[PDB]
Design an enzyme around this catalytic site. Structure first.
Site, mmCIF file in Angstrom:
data_model
loop_
_atom_site.group_PDB
_atom_site.id
_atom_site.type_symbol
_atom_site.label_atom_id
_atom_site.label_comp_id
_atom_site.label_asym_id
_atom_site.label_seq_id
_atom_site.Cartn_x
_atom_site.Cartn_y
_atom_site.Cartn_z
ATOM 1 N N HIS A 5 0.882 -1.266 -0.087
ATOM 2 C CA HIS A 5 0.018 0.104 -0.057
ATOM 3 C C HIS A 5 0.911 1.201 0.190
ATOM 4 O O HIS A 5 2.190 1.096 0.254
ATOM 5 C CB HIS A 5 -0.960 0.100 1.191
ATOM 6 C CG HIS A 5 -0.260 -0.036 2.733
ATOM 7 N ND1 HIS A 5 -0.086 -1.189 3.223
ATOM 8 C CD2 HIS A 5 0.474 1.176 3.271
ATOM 9 C CE1 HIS A 5 0.453 -0.643 4.389
ATOM 10 N NE2 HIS A 5 0.610 0.719 4.513
ATOM 11 N N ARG A 9 -1.733 11.087 4.411
ATOM 12 C CA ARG A 9 -2.382 11.480 5.523
ATOM 13 C C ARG A 9 -3.541 12.494 5.165
ATOM 14 O O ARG A 9 -3.229 13.167 4.180
ATOM 15 C CB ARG A 9 -1.239 12.423 6.462
ATOM 16 C CG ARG A 9 -0.173 11.549 7.057
ATOM 17 C CD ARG A 9 0.609 12.357 8.017
ATOM 18 N NE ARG A 9 1.541 11.565 8.412
ATOM 19 C CZ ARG A 9 2.914 11.337 7.519
ATOM 20 N NH1 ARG A 9 3.187 11.690 6.575
ATOM 21 N NH2 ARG A 9 3.827 10.395 8.464
ATOM 22 N N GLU A 56 -3.645 3.348 2.142
ATOM 23 C CA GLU A 56 -3.831 3.551 3.595
ATOM 24 C C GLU A 56 -3.982 5.057 3.902
ATOM 25 O O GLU A 56 -3.212 5.935 3.769
ATOM 26 C CB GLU A 56 -2.630 2.961 4.338
ATOM 27 C CG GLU A 56 -2.627 3.118 5.877
ATOM 28 C CD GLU A 56 -1.445 2.845 6.409
ATOM 29 O OE1 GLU A 56 -0.244 2.617 5.786
ATOM 30 O OE2 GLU A 56 -1.465 2.513 7.668
ATOM 31 N N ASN A 60 -5.052 12.122 11.769
ATOM 32 C CA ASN A 60 -4.486 12.276 13.064
ATOM 33 C C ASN A 60 -5.387 13.220 13.900
ATOM 34 O O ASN A 60 -5.790 14.465 13.161
ATOM 35 C CB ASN A 60 -3.218 13.128 13.030
ATOM 36 C CG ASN A 60 -1.902 12.053 12.637
ATOM 37 O OD1 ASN A 60 -1.712 11.230 13.497
ATOM 38 N ND2 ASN A 60 -1.759 12.167 11.516
ATOM 39 N N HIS A 74 1.870 11.523 -7.162
ATOM 40 C CA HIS A 74 0.451 11.027 -7.361
ATOM 41 C C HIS A 74 0.366 9.486 -7.529
ATOM 42 O O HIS A 74 1.193 8.639 -7.402
ATOM 43 C CB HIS A 74 -0.005 11.542 -8.824
ATOM 44 C CG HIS A 74 0.489 11.011 -9.999
ATOM 45 N ND1 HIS A 74 1.482 11.566 -10.785
ATOM 46 C CD2 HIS A 74 0.523 9.600 -10.703
ATOM 47 C CE1 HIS A 74 1.935 10.877 -11.871
ATOM 48 N NE2 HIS A 74 1.388 9.613 -11.749
ATOM 49 N N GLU A 122 -4.014 10.254 -10.950
ATOM 50 C CA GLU A 122 -4.306 10.094 -12.416
ATOM 51 C C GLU A 122 -5.173 8.901 -12.689
ATOM 52 O O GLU A 122 -4.921 7.807 -12.243
ATOM 53 C CB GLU A 122 -2.389 9.587 -12.911
ATOM 54 C CG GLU A 122 -2.578 9.630 -14.434
ATOM 55 C CD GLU A 122 -1.040 8.976 -14.857
ATOM 56 O OE1 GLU A 122 -0.557 8.387 -13.991
ATOM 57 O OE2 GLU A 122 -0.677 9.473 -15.897
HETATM 58 ZN ZN ZN Z 1 1.825 8.162 -13.464
HETATM 59 ZN ZN ZN Z 2 1.728 1.636 5.921
#
Ligand code: ZN
Ligand code: ZN
EC number: 4.4.1.5
Lengths: 128, 128
Positions: A5, A9, A56, A60, A74, A122
Protein backbone atom coordinates in the site's frame (compact mmCIF):
# COMPACT_ATOMS: atom_id res chain seq x y z
CA UNK A 1 7.91 -9.54 -2.08
CA UNK A 2 5.17 -7.25 -3.09
CA UNK A 3 3.95 -3.68 -3.02
CA UNK A 4 1.30 -3.58 -0.26
CA UNK A 5 0.00 0.00 0.00
CA UNK A 6 0.72 3.70 -0.23
CA UNK A 7 -0.05 5.79 2.86
CA UNK A 8 -1.49 9.30 2.65
CA UNK A 9 -2.37 11.59 5.57
CA UNK A 10 -5.80 13.12 5.26
CA UNK A 11 -7.59 16.00 6.95
CA UNK A 12 -10.89 14.18 7.37
CA UNK A 13 -11.14 10.41 7.48
CA UNK A 14 -14.73 9.90 6.53
CA UNK A 15 -14.59 12.50 3.78
CA UNK A 16 -11.67 10.61 2.22
CA UNK A 17 -13.34 7.23 2.63
CA UNK A 18 -16.46 8.61 1.03
CA UNK A 19 -14.39 9.87 -1.89
CA UNK A 20 -12.38 6.72 -2.58
CA UNK A 21 -15.40 4.44 -2.22
CA UNK A 22 -18.43 6.37 -3.47
CA UNK A 23 -16.63 8.36 -6.13
CA UNK A 24 -13.72 6.15 -7.21
CA UNK A 25 -15.39 2.75 -6.78
CA UNK A 26 -13.17 1.40 -4.05
CA UNK A 27 -14.25 -0.59 -1.03
CA UNK A 28 -13.48 0.05 2.60
CA UNK A 29 -11.33 -2.89 3.53
CA UNK A 30 -10.79 -2.18 7.16
CA UNK A 31 -10.44 0.63 9.63
CA UNK A 32 -8.78 1.13 12.94
CA UNK A 33 -8.14 3.55 15.72
CA UNK A 34 -5.20 4.19 17.97
CA UNK A 35 -6.25 5.89 21.14
CA UNK A 36 -2.76 5.97 22.58
CA UNK A 37 -1.36 7.91 19.67
CA UNK A 38 -4.56 9.62 18.65
CA UNK A 39 -4.98 8.61 15.04
CA UNK A 40 -7.38 6.60 12.89
CA UNK A 41 -6.70 4.57 9.75
CA UNK A 42 -8.66 3.35 6.84
CA UNK A 43 -7.58 1.00 4.08
CA UNK A 44 -9.29 1.37 0.73
CA UNK A 45 -8.76 -0.67 -2.42
CA UNK A 46 -10.24 -2.50 -5.36
CA UNK A 47 -9.49 -5.96 -4.07
CA UNK A 48 -8.17 -7.85 -1.02
CA UNK A 49 -4.92 -6.72 0.55
CA UNK A 50 -3.55 -10.26 0.22
CA UNK A 51 -3.72 -9.95 -3.53
CA UNK A 52 -3.20 -6.30 -4.36
CA UNK A 53 -1.81 -2.88 -3.48
CA UNK A 54 -4.21 -0.57 -1.74
CA UNK A 55 -4.41 2.87 -0.11
CA UNK A 56 -3.86 3.51 3.61
CA UNK A 57 -5.48 6.73 4.81
CA UNK A 58 -4.31 8.21 8.07
CA UNK A 59 -6.21 10.71 10.16
CA UNK A 60 -4.45 12.33 13.12
CA UNK A 61 -7.08 13.56 15.59
CA UNK A 62 -7.35 17.32 15.45
CA UNK A 63 -5.17 17.68 12.35
CA UNK A 64 -6.99 18.79 9.23
CA UNK A 65 -4.19 20.06 7.05
CA UNK A 66 -0.67 19.14 5.95
CA UNK A 67 2.08 20.56 3.76
CA UNK A 68 1.93 18.68 0.46
CA UNK A 69 5.53 19.33 -0.51
CA UNK A 70 6.92 19.02 -4.01
CA UNK A 71 8.33 15.51 -3.83
CA UNK A 72 5.22 13.28 -3.85
CA UNK A 73 3.68 12.94 -7.30
CA UNK A 74 0.46 11.02 -7.49
CA UNK A 75 -1.26 7.69 -7.65
CA UNK A 76 -2.51 6.31 -10.94
CA UNK A 77 -5.64 4.18 -11.05
CA UNK A 78 -7.15 2.29 -13.96
CA UNK A 79 -10.58 3.72 -14.79
CA UNK A 80 -13.61 2.01 -16.41
CA UNK A 81 -14.89 5.21 -17.97
CA UNK A 82 -12.62 8.25 -17.70
CA UNK A 83 -15.12 10.78 -18.94
CA UNK A 84 -17.78 9.58 -16.56
CA UNK A 85 -15.37 9.42 -13.63
CA UNK A 86 -14.44 13.03 -14.23
CA UNK A 87 -18.10 13.92 -14.08
CA UNK A 88 -18.68 12.02 -10.91
CA UNK A 89 -15.58 13.66 -9.47
CA UNK A 90 -16.63 17.11 -10.57
CA UNK A 91 -19.95 16.73 -8.81
CA UNK A 92 -18.62 14.83 -5.86
CA UNK A 93 -16.08 16.99 -4.05
CA UNK A 94 -13.11 16.71 -6.41
CA UNK A 95 -11.41 18.89 -8.99
CA UNK A 96 -10.64 17.87 -12.53
CA UNK A 97 -7.17 19.13 -13.41
CA UNK A 98 -6.94 17.47 -16.82
CA UNK A 99 -10.14 16.60 -18.64
CA UNK A 100 -10.45 13.07 -19.97
CA UNK A 101 -8.84 12.59 -23.35
CA UNK A 102 -6.17 10.78 -25.30
CA UNK A 103 -2.77 11.24 -23.77
CA UNK A 104 -0.22 13.33 -25.64
CA UNK A 105 1.20 11.42 -28.57
CA UNK A 106 -1.19 8.52 -27.88
CA UNK A 107 -4.72 7.16 -27.91
CA UNK A 108 -5.10 6.01 -24.33
CA UNK A 109 -7.61 8.17 -22.58
CA UNK A 110 -6.33 9.70 -19.40
CA UNK A 111 -7.30 12.33 -16.90
CA UNK A 112 -6.01 14.02 -13.78
CA UNK A 113 -8.02 14.90 -10.71
CA UNK A 114 -7.62 15.91 -7.12
CA UNK A 115 -8.98 14.18 -4.07
CA UNK A 116 -10.52 16.14 -1.19
CA UNK A 117 -7.12 16.86 0.39
CA UNK A 118 -5.62 18.00 -2.92
CA UNK A 119 -3.71 14.78 -3.65
CA UNK A 120 -3.21 14.27 -7.37
CA UNK A 121 -4.83 11.24 -8.98
CA UNK A 122 -4.05 9.99 -12.46
CA UNK A 123 -6.94 8.10 -14.19
CA UNK A 124 -6.07 5.70 -16.99
CA UNK A 125 -8.75 4.15 -19.07
CA UNK A 126 -7.02 0.84 -19.78
CA UNK A 127 -1.69 -14.66 -19.19
CA UNK A 128 -5.23 -13.98 -20.42
CA UNK B 1 -10.24 -1.20 -11.64
CA UNK B 2 -6.86 -1.33 -9.98
CA UNK B 3 -4.01 0.64 -8.45
CA UNK B 4 -1.42 1.08 -11.22
CA UNK B 5 1.44 2.96 -9.58
CA UNK B 6 2.61 5.59 -7.12
CA UNK B 7 4.73 8.33 -8.66
CA UNK B 8 7.59 9.88 -6.73
CA UNK B 9 10.01 12.58 -7.92
CA UNK B 10 13.64 11.69 -7.23
CA UNK B 11 16.81 13.76 -7.29
CA UNK B 12 18.90 11.19 -9.18
CA UNK B 13 17.27 8.62 -11.46
CA UNK B 14 19.99 5.98 -11.51
CA UNK B 15 20.53 6.35 -7.80
CA UNK B 16 16.91 5.53 -7.22
CA UNK B 17 16.88 2.85 -9.81
CA UNK B 18 19.83 1.20 -8.12
CA UNK B 19 18.15 1.31 -4.73
CA UNK B 20 14.82 -0.11 -5.76
CA UNK B 21 16.33 -2.90 -7.88
CA UNK B 22 19.62 -3.87 -6.26
CA UNK B 23 18.61 -3.22 -2.68
CA UNK B 24 14.87 -3.90 -2.66
CA UNK B 25 14.87 -6.65 -5.30
CA UNK B 26 12.54 -4.91 -7.75
CA UNK B 27 13.08 -5.06 -11.49
CA UNK B 28 13.40 -2.13 -13.87
CA UNK B 29 10.25 -2.52 -15.90
CA UNK B 30 10.63 0.30 -18.33
CA UNK B 31 12.01 3.73 -18.93
CA UNK B 32 11.21 6.78 -20.97
CA UNK B 33 12.33 10.34 -21.70
CA UNK B 34 10.37 13.42 -22.72
CA UNK B 35 12.29 16.31 -24.22
CA UNK B 36 9.36 18.68 -24.35
CA UNK B 37 8.62 18.56 -20.68
CA UNK B 38 12.18 17.69 -19.74
CA UNK B 39 11.87 14.59 -17.60
CA UNK B 40 12.84 10.91 -17.59
CA UNK B 41 10.93 8.07 -16.00
CA UNK B 42 11.71 4.69 -14.52
CA UNK B 43 9.08 2.13 -13.55
CA UNK B 44 10.17 -0.36 -10.98
CA UNK B 45 8.12 -3.15 -9.48
CA UNK B 46 7.93 -6.73 -8.30
CA UNK B 47 5.80 -7.76 -11.23
CA UNK B 48 4.82 -6.42 -14.65
CA UNK B 49 2.62 -3.32 -14.80
CA UNK B 50 -0.24 -5.44 -16.11
CA UNK B 51 -0.14 -7.59 -13.03
CA UNK B 52 0.78 -5.36 -10.21
CA UNK B 53 1.09 -1.91 -8.82
CA UNK B 54 4.52 -0.37 -9.28
CA UNK B 55 6.53 2.73 -8.60
CA UNK B 56 7.03 5.48 -11.14
CA UNK B 57 10.27 7.30 -10.45
CA UNK B 58 10.30 10.72 -12.00
CA UNK B 59 13.45 12.67 -12.74
CA UNK B 60 13.07 16.28 -13.88
CA UNK B 61 16.19 17.28 -15.76
CA UNK B 62 18.55 19.33 -13.58
CA UNK B 63 16.31 18.99 -10.51
CA UNK B 64 18.11 17.22 -7.72
CA UNK B 65 16.06 18.25 -4.69
CA UNK B 66 12.44 18.47 -3.56
CA UNK B 67 10.50 19.26 -0.41
CA UNK B 68 9.15 16.02 1.09
CA UNK B 69 6.45 17.85 3.08
CA UNK B 70 4.30 16.36 5.84
CA UNK B 71 1.33 14.96 3.88
CA UNK B 72 2.72 11.97 2.02
CA UNK B 73 3.26 9.01 4.29
CA UNK B 74 5.00 6.03 2.71
CA UNK B 75 4.91 2.90 0.60
CA UNK B 76 4.76 -0.52 2.35
CA UNK B 77 6.49 -3.58 1.01
CA UNK B 78 6.54 -7.16 2.15
CA UNK B 79 9.85 -8.75 2.95
CA UNK B 80 11.00 -12.25 3.78
CA UNK B 81 13.28 -10.99 6.53
CA UNK B 82 12.98 -7.44 7.83
CA UNK B 83 16.23 -7.57 9.80
CA UNK B 84 18.27 -8.63 6.81
CA UNK B 85 16.63 -6.04 4.57
CA UNK B 86 17.30 -3.31 7.13
CA UNK B 87 20.97 -4.08 7.20
CA UNK B 88 21.24 -4.24 3.42
CA UNK B 89 19.39 -0.93 3.13
CA UNK B 90 21.43 0.90 5.75
CA UNK B 91 24.62 -0.11 3.90
CA UNK B 92 23.37 0.73 0.44
CA UNK B 93 22.17 4.36 0.21
CA UNK B 94 19.28 4.06 2.64
CA UNK B 95 18.62 4.79 6.28
CA UNK B 96 16.86 2.80 9.03
CA UNK B 97 14.47 4.91 11.08
CA UNK B 98 12.59 2.13 12.88
CA UNK B 99 14.54 -1.06 13.68
CA UNK B 100 12.89 -4.34 12.75
CA UNK B 101 10.63 -5.65 15.49
CA UNK B 102 7.13 -6.61 16.47
CA UNK B 103 4.39 -4.08 16.48
CA UNK B 104 3.24 -2.95 19.91
CA UNK B 105 0.55 -5.32 21.10
CA UNK B 106 1.31 -7.51 18.09
CA UNK B 107 3.58 -10.17 16.62
CA UNK B 108 3.85 -8.86 13.09
CA UNK B 109 7.42 -7.75 12.32
CA UNK B 110 7.95 -4.35 10.74
CA UNK B 111 10.58 -1.72 10.12
CA UNK B 112 10.73 1.73 8.65
CA UNK B 113 13.46 2.91 6.38
CA UNK B 114 14.18 5.80 4.05
CA UNK B 115 15.27 5.68 0.44
CA UNK B 116 18.07 7.79 -1.08
CA UNK B 117 15.71 10.77 -1.41
CA UNK B 118 14.35 10.44 2.12
CA UNK B 119 11.12 8.74 1.18
CA UNK B 120 9.76 6.56 3.96
CA UNK B 121 9.33 2.86 3.33
CA UNK B 122 7.51 0.44 5.63
CA UNK B 123 8.78 -3.13 5.59
CA UNK B 124 6.25 -5.75 6.69
CA UNK B 125 7.51 -9.26 7.35
CA UNK B 126 5.52 -12.11 5.88
CA UNK B 127 11.64 -22.77 15.35
CA UNK B 128 14.70 -20.54 15.20
ZN1 ZN C 1 1.91 8.28 -13.26
ZN1 ZN D 1 1.54 1.62 6.09
Amino acid sequence: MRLLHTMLRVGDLQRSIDFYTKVLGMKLLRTSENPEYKYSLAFVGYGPETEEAVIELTYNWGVDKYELGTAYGHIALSVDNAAEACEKIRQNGGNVTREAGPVKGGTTVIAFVEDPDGYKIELIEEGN
